Design a protein around this motif. Structure first.
Motif, mmCIF file in Angstrom:
data_model
loop_
_atom_site.group_PDB
_atom_site.id
_atom_site.type_symbol
_atom_site.label_atom_id
_atom_site.label_comp_id
_atom_site.label_asym_id
_atom_site.label_seq_id
_atom_site.Cartn_x
_atom_site.Cartn_y
_atom_site.Cartn_z
ATOM 1 N N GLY A 1 0.847 -1.178 0.000
ATOM 2 C CA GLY A 1 0.000 0.000 0.000
ATOM 3 C C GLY A 1 0.891 1.239 0.000
ATOM 4 N N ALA A 2 0.648 2.164 0.915
ATOM 5 C CA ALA A 2 1.427 3.374 1.054
ATOM 6 C C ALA A 2 2.778 3.138 1.680
ATOM 7 C CB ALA A 2 0.678 4.426 1.855
ATOM 8 N N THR A 3 3.004 1.979 2.303
ATOM 9 C CA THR A 3 4.241 1.713 3.029
ATOM 10 C C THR A 3 5.353 1.317 2.062
ATOM 11 O OG1 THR A 3 2.882 0.927 4.855
ATOM 12 C CG2 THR A 3 5.240 0.396 4.959
ATOM 13 N N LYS A 4 6.503 1.947 2.226
ATOM 14 C CA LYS A 4 7.715 1.596 1.502
ATOM 15 C C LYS A 4 8.442 0.465 2.221
ATOM 16 C CE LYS A 4 8.258 6.328 -0.117
ATOM 17 N NZ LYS A 4 9.167 7.491 -0.349
ATOM 18 N N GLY A 5 9.122 -0.384 1.453
ATOM 19 C CA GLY A 5 9.838 -1.493 2.067
ATOM 20 C C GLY A 5 10.919 -2.073 1.208
ATOM 21 N N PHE A 6 11.678 -3.011 1.788
ATOM 22 C CA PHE A 6 12.482 -3.898 0.971
ATOM 23 C C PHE A 6 12.404 -5.296 1.526
ATOM 24 C CE2 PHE A 6 16.087 -2.223 3.719
ATOM 25 C CZ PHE A 6 16.627 -3.390 4.193
#
Length: 198
Positions: A26-31
Protein backbone atom coordinates in the motif's frame (compact mmCIF):
# COMPACT_ATOMS: atom_id res chain seq x y z
CA UNK A 1 18.75 6.57 1.56
CA UNK A 2 18.28 5.26 -1.98
CA UNK A 3 17.09 1.66 -1.83
CA UNK A 4 18.90 -0.50 -4.43
CA UNK A 5 19.16 -4.29 -4.47
CA UNK A 6 22.50 -5.61 -3.26
CA UNK A 7 23.58 -2.74 -1.05
CA UNK A 8 24.66 -3.13 2.55
CA UNK A 9 22.50 -2.46 5.57
CA UNK A 10 23.08 -3.16 9.27
CA UNK A 11 20.71 -4.73 11.77
CA UNK A 12 20.65 -3.36 15.33
CA UNK A 13 24.06 -1.81 14.65
CA UNK A 14 25.50 -5.32 14.51
CA UNK A 15 25.12 -7.75 11.61
CA UNK A 16 25.38 -6.76 7.98
CA UNK A 17 23.20 -8.06 5.19
CA UNK A 18 22.22 -7.00 1.66
CA UNK A 19 19.01 -5.44 0.35
CA UNK A 20 16.88 -7.75 -1.79
CA UNK A 21 14.34 -5.59 -3.65
CA UNK A 22 12.36 -2.39 -3.22
CA UNK A 23 8.66 -3.13 -2.60
CA UNK A 24 5.48 -1.39 -1.51
CA UNK A 25 2.71 -2.51 0.80
CA UNK A 26 0.00 0.00 0.00
CA UNK A 27 1.43 3.37 1.05
CA UNK A 28 4.24 1.71 3.03
CA UNK A 29 7.71 1.60 1.50
CA UNK A 30 9.84 -1.49 2.07
CA UNK A 31 12.48 -3.90 0.97
CA UNK A 32 12.55 -7.68 1.02
CA UNK A 33 15.55 -9.51 2.42
CA UNK A 34 16.45 -12.78 4.23
CA UNK A 35 14.71 -13.72 7.45
CA UNK A 36 17.90 -14.78 9.16
CA UNK A 37 19.13 -11.16 8.86
CA UNK A 38 16.86 -9.81 11.61
CA UNK A 39 14.07 -10.33 14.10
CA UNK A 40 10.80 -8.43 14.07
CA UNK A 41 11.28 -4.79 15.13
CA UNK A 42 15.07 -4.88 14.58
CA UNK A 43 16.40 -1.55 13.29
CA UNK A 44 17.88 -1.28 9.78
CA UNK A 45 20.52 1.35 8.97
CA UNK A 46 22.08 2.40 5.67
CA UNK A 47 24.97 4.93 5.60
CA UNK A 48 24.76 5.18 9.41
CA UNK A 49 21.15 6.43 9.34
CA UNK A 50 18.06 4.55 10.50
CA UNK A 51 15.95 3.65 7.45
CA UNK A 52 13.29 1.40 8.99
CA UNK A 53 12.57 -1.75 10.97
CA UNK A 54 11.92 -5.43 10.31
CA UNK A 55 8.15 -5.74 9.86
CA UNK A 56 7.95 -9.55 9.57
CA UNK A 57 10.18 -12.55 9.09
CA UNK A 58 10.11 -16.32 8.79
CA UNK A 59 13.33 -18.17 9.65
CA UNK A 60 14.08 -21.09 9.74
CA UNK A 61 11.60 -23.23 7.79
CA UNK A 62 11.59 -20.39 5.27
CA UNK A 63 14.18 -17.61 5.06
CA UNK A 64 12.36 -14.36 4.32
CA UNK A 65 11.67 -10.92 5.74
CA UNK A 66 10.67 -7.43 4.82
CA UNK A 67 11.82 -4.13 6.27
CA UNK A 68 9.27 -1.37 6.47
CA UNK A 69 10.92 1.94 5.66
CA UNK A 70 10.32 5.53 6.64
CA UNK A 71 8.60 7.64 3.99
CA UNK A 72 11.90 9.60 3.54
CA UNK A 73 13.50 6.58 1.81
CA UNK A 74 13.70 6.48 -1.96
CA UNK A 75 12.55 3.20 -3.48
CA UNK A 76 14.23 2.29 -6.78
CA UNK A 77 13.54 -0.49 -9.32
CA UNK A 78 17.25 -1.39 -9.45
CA UNK A 79 19.91 -3.88 -8.41
CA UNK A 80 23.58 -2.91 -8.10
CA UNK A 81 26.01 -4.20 -10.72
CA UNK A 82 29.31 -2.55 -9.86
CA UNK A 83 28.82 1.15 -10.39
CA UNK A 84 25.84 0.50 -12.66
CA UNK A 85 22.36 -1.00 -12.33
CA UNK A 86 20.13 -3.82 -13.48
CA UNK A 87 16.54 -2.66 -13.86
CA UNK A 88 13.89 -4.70 -12.05
CA UNK A 89 11.25 -5.50 -14.68
CA UNK A 90 9.11 -8.17 -12.99
CA UNK A 91 9.19 -11.42 -11.02
CA UNK A 92 8.77 -14.09 -13.66
CA UNK A 93 10.35 -17.39 -12.27
CA UNK A 94 13.19 -18.71 -14.42
CA UNK A 95 13.58 -22.46 -14.97
CA UNK A 96 16.40 -24.70 -13.98
CA UNK A 97 19.16 -24.14 -16.55
CA UNK A 98 18.57 -20.42 -16.88
CA UNK A 99 21.33 -17.92 -16.36
CA UNK A 100 20.95 -15.82 -13.18
CA UNK A 101 22.94 -13.24 -11.25
CA UNK A 102 23.01 -12.08 -7.65
CA UNK A 103 24.12 -8.91 -5.90
CA UNK A 104 25.38 -8.31 -2.37
CA UNK A 105 27.77 -6.33 -0.23
CA UNK A 106 30.54 -8.94 0.06
CA UNK A 107 31.12 -10.46 -3.35
CA UNK A 108 29.29 -7.85 -5.45
CA UNK A 109 27.49 -8.90 -8.62
CA UNK A 110 28.06 -12.56 -9.62
CA UNK A 111 26.49 -14.66 -12.33
CA UNK A 112 25.95 -18.35 -13.00
CA UNK A 113 23.02 -20.62 -13.75
CA UNK A 114 20.12 -22.08 -11.81
CA UNK A 115 21.05 -25.71 -11.06
CA UNK A 116 18.17 -27.00 -8.88
CA UNK A 117 14.87 -26.22 -7.18
CA UNK A 118 13.26 -27.23 -3.92
CA UNK A 119 16.56 -27.63 -2.04
CA UNK A 120 16.75 -28.03 1.74
CA UNK A 121 19.51 -26.28 3.69
CA UNK A 122 20.32 -27.56 7.16
CA UNK A 123 21.44 -24.46 8.99
CA UNK A 124 22.44 -24.19 12.65
CA UNK A 125 19.00 -22.89 13.52
CA UNK A 126 17.07 -25.53 11.64
CA UNK A 127 16.18 -26.65 8.13
CA UNK A 128 15.06 -24.22 5.44
CA UNK A 129 13.14 -25.92 2.64
CA UNK A 130 12.08 -24.99 -0.87
CA UNK A 131 15.23 -23.07 -1.87
CA UNK A 132 16.44 -22.38 -5.36
CA UNK A 133 20.05 -23.24 -6.10
CA UNK A 134 22.51 -21.60 -8.45
CA UNK A 135 26.23 -21.76 -9.08
CA UNK A 136 26.98 -18.05 -8.96
CA UNK A 137 29.38 -17.58 -6.10
CA UNK A 138 28.59 -15.71 -2.87
CA UNK A 139 29.99 -15.04 0.59
CA UNK A 140 29.12 -14.08 4.16
CA UNK A 141 27.18 -10.83 4.13
CA UNK A 142 25.61 -11.36 0.71
CA UNK A 143 22.55 -12.78 2.51
CA UNK A 144 19.33 -10.99 1.72
CA UNK A 145 20.63 -9.71 -1.58
CA UNK A 146 18.99 -9.82 -4.96
CA UNK A 147 18.90 -12.78 -7.34
CA UNK A 148 17.85 -11.46 -10.76
CA UNK A 149 18.20 -12.44 -14.39
CA UNK A 150 20.06 -10.16 -16.80
CA UNK A 151 16.69 -9.43 -18.33
CA UNK A 152 15.44 -7.96 -15.04
CA UNK A 153 13.26 -10.77 -13.65
CA UNK A 154 13.68 -10.86 -9.87
CA UNK A 155 14.09 -14.47 -8.66
CA UNK A 156 14.64 -14.39 -4.92
CA UNK A 157 16.86 -13.31 -2.07
CA UNK A 158 20.16 -14.84 -0.95
CA UNK A 159 19.78 -17.37 1.89
CA UNK A 160 23.06 -19.27 2.16
CA UNK A 161 25.61 -21.41 0.48
CA UNK A 162 28.63 -23.71 0.86
CA UNK A 163 31.11 -21.04 1.88
CA UNK A 164 34.73 -22.14 2.33
CA UNK A 165 37.24 -21.05 4.98
CA UNK A 166 37.72 -17.75 3.19
CA UNK A 167 34.03 -16.93 3.75
CA UNK A 168 32.88 -17.41 0.18
CA UNK A 169 32.53 -20.10 -2.50
CA UNK A 170 34.19 -18.03 -5.24
CA UNK A 171 37.46 -19.95 -4.89
CA UNK A 172 35.96 -23.31 -5.91
CA UNK A 173 34.70 -24.20 -9.35
CA UNK A 174 31.08 -23.46 -10.30
CA UNK A 175 30.44 -27.23 -10.50
CA UNK A 176 31.10 -27.39 -6.75
CA UNK A 177 29.05 -24.42 -5.63
CA UNK A 178 25.68 -24.51 -3.91
CA UNK A 179 24.35 -20.95 -3.58
CA UNK A 180 20.79 -20.96 -2.27
CA UNK A 181 18.03 -18.40 -2.67
CA UNK A 182 14.59 -17.98 -1.14
CA UNK A 183 12.03 -17.60 -3.93
CA UNK A 184 10.60 -14.13 -4.22
CA UNK A 185 7.05 -15.04 -5.23
CA UNK A 186 5.97 -16.50 -1.81
CA UNK A 187 7.51 -13.53 0.01
CA UNK A 188 5.48 -11.10 -2.07
CA UNK A 189 2.19 -12.93 -1.50
CA UNK A 190 2.84 -13.75 2.17
CA UNK A 191 3.25 -10.07 3.00
CA UNK A 192 1.02 -8.51 0.34
CA UNK A 193 3.96 -6.74 -1.33
CA UNK A 194 4.34 -5.32 -4.83
CA UNK A 195 7.69 -5.18 -6.50
CA UNK A 196 8.91 -1.71 -7.59
CA UNK A 197 9.64 -2.02 -11.33
CA UNK A 198 11.03 0.18 -14.09
Amino acid sequence: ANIVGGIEYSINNASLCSVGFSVTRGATKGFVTAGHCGTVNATARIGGAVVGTFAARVFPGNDRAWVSLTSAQTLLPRVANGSSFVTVRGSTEAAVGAAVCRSGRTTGYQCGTITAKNVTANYAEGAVRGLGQGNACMGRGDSGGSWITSAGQAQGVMSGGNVQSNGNNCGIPASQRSSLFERLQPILSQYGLSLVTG
